[PDB]
Amino acid sequence: MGVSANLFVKQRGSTTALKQPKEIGFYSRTKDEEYLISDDTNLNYYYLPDAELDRKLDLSSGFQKFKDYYKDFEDRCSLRGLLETIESSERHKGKKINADIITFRGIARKLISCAFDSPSFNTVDLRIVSFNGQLFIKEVPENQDLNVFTGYKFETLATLSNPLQYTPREVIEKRTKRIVSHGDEYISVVRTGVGNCKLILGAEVDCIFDFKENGRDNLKHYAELKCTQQVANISDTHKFERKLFRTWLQCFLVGIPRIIYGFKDDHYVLKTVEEFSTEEVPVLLKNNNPQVGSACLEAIKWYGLLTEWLLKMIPRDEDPHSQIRAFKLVFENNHLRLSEIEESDEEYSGLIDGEHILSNGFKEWRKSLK
């Protein structure tokens, strides 16, 4: 073990705010694990009139024909498209993009949630880290399945594959019968930062709301549509508020402006929809449940403490990308985060060093070519 460190989960930093986010580029992932850099076939357009809420739409319908392609994937967390998108954005401007860590938004949300959620209820996974001249992070792949399907149907009912203006009327009328599928994303690449720490986050986004802008940050026009739940008794408000708080990070970390919740009655019957701006939620929580609302600036200060910790828990920032690399397991356990070198005596270390199991050859060649 050439390096090791711990961080106690309830220690907190001091910086009050994130940097302003910016969109570098994007990719979409086919049903076939093909990655389409700079292509947007999978970007849905939001559409659900208020009159639809009168219809007794059922979020279970078509469950038996659900095409869950994601289970069949070879590398269910593979960063390849993000790395290739960053490559595409660097190539036409002749230099490295100065960010300290490259990762998915889900990994970042998992990390920041450690300050609040117990590891069992969090399902806090194993994580893996490596450097080349900057840090890279990957997640280790792991009735309730009908609750999973519900979100994917609700997102399918609420959207169109193309702009409403261009959609022919038959495609709207068919919509309730349409097959539902998962593992077919559109993912944006977002530059961001906390304190003096600079980042790139890959983030899935459900749909666009106003319009596409060509060759510009579309970031102010996306939304999240969230998997639905009933709210009808006072304790449901707190159960909802926890879900809302988790949802706020998930938009805020990448500057997404719109959060939409659908609400079930019971069974799988859709009853209502509500919407929030990302800027409302901290204040809305500050009024209705202060002990939850308070957690936002605690989460931001904790995210500062974390990222400084990662940049000081014996990382390497050895800038020549031809230098010998290093590789670490990361976990959250018993209110400690844990970090440990993967020694070359273990097969995983030999794999992550010598092979594409973390970072793709084309990306490694690109940065070795300066």
């Binding site: 009159a51 409403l164 709207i172 709210v231 209502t272």
Partner: protein, 651 residues
């Protein structure tokens, strides 16, 4: 004409649609009183050109100059009432489709018949020196306002002169619809129409933009009224309800069917069915039929401007079952010229009515009936298409002076219907089509010789006196002129033969001149537009700008004027404008529709406050000033089962 009973039907069924125009005591930009602000305004311009050229008040204006002065005075009042904040559309009336021309021609000939009695206004058609003089004048008046009033420093103005073809009411729908097709279109722009016509109510609904208001003079009690489309949709939600439908209920489609019934039972192109005398005592009868028939159908009857003939047959069959009793009840309630129809309906109906109207032998009637029913159903389709997706054909028309009886509408369900967008007529071809020979002084008088001279190939189209046909005991002005229908191939070949004899100055104003125009005054786009279109790389204007709704609340395609306008130039009234430092103007075009327009509410529409209450709706199931614009931010109503709704429902 005096205040139609149609408005009495509106105020009897739907009283809360009306509200007075709030008015003041000259600065343009100050916030207006009538409970909202307007982004866009649309003018039915013939709806002031006619009241100027022939007022209901006793004094006429004495000259074209005084008529134009009166038009400028009246439009100044209209804009000061409405205050459009982002765009204004002039929509001057233009060359019409054949189906319109052959109806207008009859009214035009009847006016020259009336002029012989007056010797003991036909200049207002497209292509005349008068409308050409208006097209110079109205542009100048607009440029003067944009140059001199700073309240308009952000405003855009769209000008669509009589040289641009299409009926003005149709030009407006094409404009609204092509803006509505832009992905960047703001779902909540407030809209207004000025115009005298009753049909505007149905066209407002036919946009499916719920923020529309219609501006009108009440003929009784110079006051003005708003009619809010926003409130009419609220009313129709109760009135159009039917329980137990096999397909799902949907308010946009129900409203399209109701609009279709209104155009069916009283129309500007087709003759009315003899059973269906006037809209205001007729629509409710077809609506009761629709409420009875609807649960037997596979769907709603109309779809995005397209019919379902199989369904419509069932309504017309039900109307046929009532038609005889409708004739009985009309006669019970009563308790050169050709108008004698003392045989009524009860003896033989169609078996004796047809020979009485058409002078045809009883063995031929089955063939005539089958052809007329085909033509009338094609007409009903062309009408529905015209307003929902634009004209299918400029060449199509109904071949006859009269309609079938309700008994006759069956066996057409097998049909499929087709059309071609063949090019509309030139200005002089339009004039030659509609003018009686007395008004022939409005043409270059070479063409006038073909109307009047006994050697002409086309004299049959210009009868100096003609048969006229009064109906339904209308002892009034309302008689049908039984004029011969024009063969357009014979007319157009006779007219076009004169063209090489005309001057270049007479070929001017007979060229199409198709560009609409746009004018700006240090607007948000001003430097971008100027930079490309007038400091252009080329002297020849191949350079064109497309632009999108988000930046300035308008979209379109834009290019240099053809009119000899230049960036440093200034111009004079037909009070010099100094445009050289104040204005830019451009030829303009609509962005063509990406695909067929949908009858749907667009994404991001926010409703206004509700105006009706349970006591109103329960009366239909048996007012004051009102708000305009979006009621806050949320796209969805508060409902049971929701977080933000929970605190609301618990007060």
């Amino acid at each position: 004409m005096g205040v139609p009973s149609f408005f009495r039907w509106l105020s009897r069924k739907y009283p809360k649609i009306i509200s007075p125009v709030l008015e003041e005591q000259p600065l343009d930009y100050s916030a207006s009183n009538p409970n909202g602000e307007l982004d866009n305004l649309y003018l039915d311009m013939n709806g002031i050109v006619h009241p100027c050229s022939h007022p209901e008040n006793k004094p006429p204006p004495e000259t074209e100059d005084e008529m134009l002065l009166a038009v400028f005075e009246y439009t100044n009042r209209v804009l000061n009432m409405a205050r459009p904040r982002k765009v204004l559309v002039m929509a001057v009336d233009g060359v019409a489709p054949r189906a319109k021309m052959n109806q207008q021609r009859a009214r035009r000939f009847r006016s020259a018949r009336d002029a012989q009695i007056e010797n003991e206004s036909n200049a207002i058609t497209p292509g005349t020196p008068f409308m050409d003089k208006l097209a110079a004048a109205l542009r100048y008046w607009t440029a003067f306002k944009l140059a001199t009033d700073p309240g308009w420093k952000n405003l855009q103005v769209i000008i669509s002169d009589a040289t641009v073809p299409g009926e003005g009411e149709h030009k407006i729908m094409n404009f609204i619809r092509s803006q509505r097709a832009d992905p960047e279109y703001n779902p909540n722009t407030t809209h207004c129409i000025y115009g005298l016509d009753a049909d505007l109510i149905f066209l407002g609904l036919a946009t499916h933009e719920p923020h529309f208001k219609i501006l009108r003079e009440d003929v009784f009690a110079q006051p003005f009224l708003w009619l809010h489309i926003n409130v009419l949709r609220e009313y129709l939600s109760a009135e159009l309800w039917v329980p137990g439908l096999p397909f799902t209920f949907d308010l946009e489609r129900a409203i399209d069917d109701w609009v279709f019934m209104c155009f069916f039972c009283g129309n500007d192109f087709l003759p009315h069915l003899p059973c269906l005398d006037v809209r205001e005592n007729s629509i409710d009868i077809l609506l009761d039929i629709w409420k009875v028939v609807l649960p037997k159908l596979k769907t709603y009857m109309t779809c995005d401007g397209v019919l379902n003939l199989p369904s419509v047959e069932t309504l017309l069959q039900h109307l046929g079952s009532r038609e005889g009793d409708i004739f009985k009840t009309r006669h019970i309630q009563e308790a050169f010229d050709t108008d004698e129809f003392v045989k009524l309906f009860e003896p033989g109906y169609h078996e004796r009515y047809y020979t009485a109207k058409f002078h045809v032998t009883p063995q031929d009637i089955e063939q005539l009936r089958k052809d007329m029913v085909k033509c009338y159903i094609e007409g009903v389709a062309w009408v529905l298409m015209y307003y929902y997706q634009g004209c299918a054909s400029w060449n199509w028309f109904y071949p006859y002076h009269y309609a079938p009886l309700a008994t006759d509408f069956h066996g057409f369900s097998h049909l499929e219907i087709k059309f071609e967008e063949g090019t509309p007529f030139l200005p002089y071809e339009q004039l030659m089509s509609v003018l009686p020979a007395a008004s022939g002084h409005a043409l270059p008088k070479i063409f006038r010789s073909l109307m009047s001279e006994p050697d002409s190939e086309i004299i049959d189209f210009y009868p100096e006196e003609f048969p006229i046909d009064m109906n339904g005991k209308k002892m009034s002005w309302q008689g049908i002129a039984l004029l011969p229908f024009i063969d357009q191939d014979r007319l157009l070949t006779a007219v076009r033969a004169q063209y090489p004899l005309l001057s270049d100055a007479e070929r001017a104003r007979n060229i199409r001149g198709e560009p609409v125009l746009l004018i700006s005054n240090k607007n948000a786009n001003y430097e971008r537009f100027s930079k490309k279109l007038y400091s252009k790389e080329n002297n020849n204007n191949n350079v064109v700008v497309k632009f999108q709704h988000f930046k300035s609340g308008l979209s379109g395609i834009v290019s240099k004027d053809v009119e000899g306008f230049e960036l440093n130039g200034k111009i004079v009234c037909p009070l010099p404008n100094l445009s050289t430092t104040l204005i830019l103007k451009m030829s303009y075009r609509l962005i063509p529709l990406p695909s067929r327009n949908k009858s749907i509410i667009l994404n991001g529409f926010i409703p206004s406050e509700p105006v009706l209450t349970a006591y109103d709706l329960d009366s239909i199931m048996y007012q004051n000033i009102v708000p305009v614009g979006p009621k806050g931010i949320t796209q969805y109503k508060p409902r049971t089962g929701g977080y933000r709704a929970f605190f609301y429902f618990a007060e």
